[PDB]
Swiss-Prot record, chain A:
Alphabetically ordered keywords of this record: Acetylation, Cytoplasmic vesicle, Endoplasmic reticulum, ER-Golgi transport, Lysosome, Membrane, mRNA transport, Nuclear pore complex, Nucleus, Phosphoprotein, Protein transport, Repeat, Translocation, Transport, WD repeat
Designated gene of the protein: SEC13
Family recorded in the similarity comment: Belongs to the WD repeat SEC13 family.
SMART domains from the UniProt entry: WD40
Source superkingdom: Eukaryota
Gene Ontology MF: a single term: structural molecule activity
Subunit-level organization: At the nuclear pore: component of the Y-shaped Nup107-160 subcomplex of the nuclear pore complex (NPC). The Nup107-160 subcomplex includes NUP160, NUP133, NUP107, NUP98, NUP85, NUP43, NUP37, SEH1 and SEC13. At the COPII coat complex: interacts with SEC31A and SEC31B. Interacts with SEC16A. Interacts with SEC16B. Component of the GATOR2 subcomplex, composed of MIOS, SEC13, SEH1L, WDR24 and WDR59. The GATOR2 complex interacts with CASTOR1 and CASTOR2; the interaction is negatively regulated by arginine.
GO CC, any one term: nucleoplasm
Regulation: The GATOR2 complex is negatively regulated by the upstream amino acid sensors CASTOR1 and SESN2, which sequester the GATOR2 complex in absence of amino acids. In the presence of abundant amino acids, GATOR2 is released from CASTOR1 and SESN2 and activated.
Coiled-coil segments on the chain, per record: none
Stretches forming WD repeats: 8-47, 52-93, 98-141, 145-188, 194-234, 241-276
Name of this protein: Protein SEC13 homolog
InterPro entries given in the database record: Sec13/Seh1_fam (IPR037363), WD40/YVTN_repeat-like_dom_sf (IPR015943), WD40_repeat_dom_sf (IPR036322), WD40_rpt (IPR001680)
Swiss-Prot record, chain B:
Binding residue positions for Zn(2+) 4: 180, 197, 201
Binding sites annotated in the UniProt record for Zn(2+) 3: 175, 203, 205
Transmembrane segment boundaries: none
Family, as annotated: Belongs to the WD repeat WDR59 family.
Organism: Homo sapiens
Region span, Disordered: 107-122
Protein name: GATOR2 complex protein WDR59
Span of the entire protein shown here: 651 to 974 of 974
Name of the coding gene: WDR59
UniProtKB/Swiss-Prot annotation, chain C:
PANTHER family for the chain: NUCLEAR PORE COMPLEX PROTEIN SEC13 / SEH1 FAMILY MEMBER, NUCLEOPORIN SEH1
Chief location of this protein within or outside the cell: nucleus
WD repeat coordinates: 7-37, 43-75, 86-125, 133-170, 171-203, 204-242
Gene giving rise to this polypeptide: SEH1L
InterPro entries reported in the protein's UniProt record: G-protein_beta_WD-40_rep, Sec13/Seh1_fam, WD40/YVTN_repeat-like_dom_sf, WD40_repeat_dom_sf, WD40_rpt
Protein name in UniProt: Nucleoporin SEH1
GO biological process terms on file: attachment of mitotic spindle microtubules to kinetochore; cell division; cellular response to amino acid starvation; cellular response to nutrient levels; defense response to Gram-positive bacterium; mitotic metaphase chromosome alignment; mRNA transport; negative regulation of TORC1 signaling
């Protein structure tokens, strides 16, 4: 169906991620606010309006309800504010400002790994806020992650302890796949370099059990690359060369349909060669 | 809402049933549910599974007794081909549900090899089947059918009561503030009307536990 | 009256009176819980009586094979965690002790094998903490001023009380039953013999059979060879009097 949700924002929207259950929608805009709507049963109810950022908010990401309904937001103010429910109202439970530049991407770790928030900032460093309990977060910043600055971070589904890995896409014209060593430190495992411009979004395809890890990335040049791992070997396959800049890429729940949104103010859905559905 | 573009349907997940006690009955119920939904290929696959999962086809302990139905082409080869086709279609729901249905039923080196060959699911590929089951449970949790998710995940390879004064061995509710508790049904019945602790300690257990 | 479906050697209620244990003449004991047989056991049963529910749904069976089987709750065909087969002679009856005195079972064969289980959760071990050498009756008194007492009948009633100072217990009779006290200062004794006898202990015209006391120990049911289950009760003068006659066949 169609659920036209009036954003009621004071500026242009930047992200819109719905909750895990598919009942609540959270959006962010340049007005330095992140108001969380309720879109249950085709409605537009403002559960809570949040204003704690000193600048525009780029991306938001809901957390798994198994660790509670928690929303994290990364803004231009080089600070990441983690919002949590407290007796039915949203409040800023924790704030992280360990980056010297604006944080552009935040994505919660898979529920199997735990409650880890991977923040990718433009300073070139990535920080992972691991929840140690009792309202205490442990930050293991990976300094100098990107040559210029990381613009996208995407976790990978739990595949076999757990070999925690995620894909980072920044302005270094390449994608860095980070692996969590047994000691605890995070080091790059493999570097993927096929884009000719700044990488804007990376989205690891959710794994359903197929022995094939799939990575979808988009860059500033307008090219969308699909990476597959049949080994740690990745063979990119150019999905399409869009006319304008491509902003975000998102996989389906079964990782068969990829949602590609670019600067042409259009949204395209691609299904497997890759053929557009829209 | 673009669920029509996905290989997983919420209606199919809600309509599916799981009972390890009787596999043919659950397979027939799943076939009926697929017919109600309208997916003919699911109907054919479920009827084939209904036929191929009957207890009359039980693998024998002795390898020399007969050829196990898994080694029969309509056994593992059918199931392997169906799993490959549904992996190509990326149908997580059907893959995991079929794996659960077929796993519910399920000289020394020769005996071990025979035990390996008598299973309609690959003993060396159980990690993939467990991954399918876990991912389908994740999708069911996404939909909200927690009971269905728990039922599917069951096939993954990996004090005295203060009301009736009967020893409690099963489900029990205990208040953390005061410490008096008993049978779950007894507490449900008692607290549906009153709000004071049955032991008489004066604790308002509803205001002390609920949240 | 209502002849519900079921030769039952002995039929007894549990504490709640919602489940009935019946010992058939074919050496079988069934838990007839509209009483429909919900269990089958093949026993190893002269008498089958339940235990207190807080101690578990334990049924004590006294057999003629010089043993006193105790079938413990393991859910249906209950598994014998314990087997009190140490009795030299056949156990005439097996009646559990009152819940206040712990898990004790009496098998008045004459050796009163009072088996005690220190571990309530693990009753598989039966310890003959006491052994005093037809009918076994337990005193339901739980008073601090009333010491526990064990009664033994011979086919004629002797009450052995576990004295605190020494920490040790110290017409043919068919069945002896002690009425529930409910705070009484005296005990009423009912003994099955050629004539029904009632006696007070204050600190059918034939061979009688297993008479029982109601939950309050006021109305009495005494059965004998006459085939009629006569109901008895007290009177305005605090004396035993007939209160009614019930027909076994249901007439
Ligand atoms: Zn209490
Ligand atoms: Zn209870
Ligand atoms: Zn309480």
């Amino acid at each position: 169906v169609i659920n036209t949700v009036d954003t009621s924002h004071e500026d242009m929207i930047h992200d819109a991620q719905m909750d895990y259950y598919g009942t609540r929608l959270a959006t962010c805009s340049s007005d330095r606010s992140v108001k969380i709507f309720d879109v249950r049963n085709g409605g537009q109810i403002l559960i809570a309006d949040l204003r704690g950022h000193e600048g525009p908010v780029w991306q938001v990401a809901w957390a798994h309800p198994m660790y509670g309904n928690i929303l994290a937001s990364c803004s231009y103010d080089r600070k990441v504010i983690i919002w949590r429910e407290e007796n039915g109202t949203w409040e800023k439970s924790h704030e992280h400002a360990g980056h010297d530049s604006s944080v552009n991407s935040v994505c919660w770790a898979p529920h199997d790994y735990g409650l880890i928030l991977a923040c990718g900032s433009s300073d070139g460093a990535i920080s992972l806020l691991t929840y140690t309990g009792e309202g205490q977060w442990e930050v293991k910043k990976i300094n100098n992650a990107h040559t210029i600055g990381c613009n996208a971070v995407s976790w990978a589904p739990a595949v076999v302890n757990y070999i925690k890995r995620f894909a980072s896409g920044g302005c270094d014209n390449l994608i860095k796949l980070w692996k969590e060593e047994e000691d605890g430190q995070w080091k790059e495992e493999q570097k993927l370099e096929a884009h000719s411009d700044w990488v804007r979004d990376v989205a690891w395809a959710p794994s359903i059990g197929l022995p094939t890890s799939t990575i979808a990335s988009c860059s500033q040049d307008g090219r969308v690359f699909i990476w597959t791992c049949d080994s740690n070997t990745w063979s990119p396959k150019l999905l399409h060369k869009f006319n304008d800049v491509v902003w975000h890429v998102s996989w389906s729940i079964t990782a068969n349909i990829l949602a590609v949104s670019g600067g042409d103010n259009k949204v395209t859905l691609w299904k497997e060669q890759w053929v557009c559905i829209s | 809402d673009i669920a029509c573009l996905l290989p997983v349907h919420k209606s199919l997940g809600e309509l599916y049933i799981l009972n390890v006690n009787d596999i043919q009955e659950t397979c027939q119920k799943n076939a009926a549910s697929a017919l109600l939904v309208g997916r003919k290929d699911l109907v054919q696959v479920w009827s084939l599974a209904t036929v191929a999962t009957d207890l009359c086809l039980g693998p024998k302990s002795d390898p020399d007794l007969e050829t196990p139905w898994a080694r029969h082409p309509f056994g593992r080869q059918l199931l392997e081909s169906l799993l490959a086709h549904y992996c190509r279609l990326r149908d997580v729901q059907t893959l995991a549900m079929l794996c659960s249905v077929f796993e519910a039923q399920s000289r020394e080196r020769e005996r071990d090899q025979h035990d390996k060959n008598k299973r309609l699911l690959d003993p060396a590929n159980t990690q993939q089947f467990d991954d399918f089951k876990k991912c389908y449970g994740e999708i069911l949790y996404r939909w909200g059918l927690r009971e269905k998710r728990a039922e599917v995940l069951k096939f993954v390879s990996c004090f005295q009561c203060a009301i009736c004064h009967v020893a409690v061995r099963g489900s029990s509710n205990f208040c953390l503030t005061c410490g008096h508790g008993g049978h779950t049904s007894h507490m449900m019945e008692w607290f549906r009307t009153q709000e004071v602790c049955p032991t008489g300690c004066g604790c308002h257990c509803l205001l002390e536990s609920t949240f | 009256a209502r002849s519900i479906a079921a030769l039952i050697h002995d039929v007894s209620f549990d504490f709640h009176g919602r489940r009935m244990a019946t010992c058939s003449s074919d050496q079988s004991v069934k838990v007839w819980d509209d009483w429909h047989c919900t269990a089958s056991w093949k026993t190893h049963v002269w008498r089958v009586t339940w235990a207190h529910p807080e101690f578990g749904q334990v049924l004590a069976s006294c057999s003629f094979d010089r043993t006193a089987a105790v079938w413990e709750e393991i859910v249906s065909h209950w598994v014998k965690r314990t087997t009190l087969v140490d009795s030299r002679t056949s156990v005439t009856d097996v009646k559990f002790a009152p819940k206040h005195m712990g898990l004790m079972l009496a098998t008045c064969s004459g050796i009163v094998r009072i088996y005690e289980a220190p571990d309530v959760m693990n009753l598989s071990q039966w310890s003959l903490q006491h052994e005093i050498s037809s009918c076994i009756s337990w005193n339901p008194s739980s008073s601090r001023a009333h010491s526990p007492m064990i009664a033994v009948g011979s086919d004629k009633v002797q009450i052995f009380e576990y004295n605190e100072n020494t920490r040790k217990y110290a017409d043919p009779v068919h069945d002896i039953a002690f009425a529930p006290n409910l705070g009484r200062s005296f005990h009423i004794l009912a003994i099955a013999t050629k004539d029904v006898r009632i006696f007070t202990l204050k600190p059918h015209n034939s061979q009688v059979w297993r008479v029982s006391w109601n939950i309050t120990g006021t109305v009495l049911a005494s059965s004998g060879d006459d085939g009629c289950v006569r109901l008895w009760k007290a009177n305005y003068m605090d004396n035993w009097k007939c209160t009614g006659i019930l027909k076994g066949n249901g007439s």
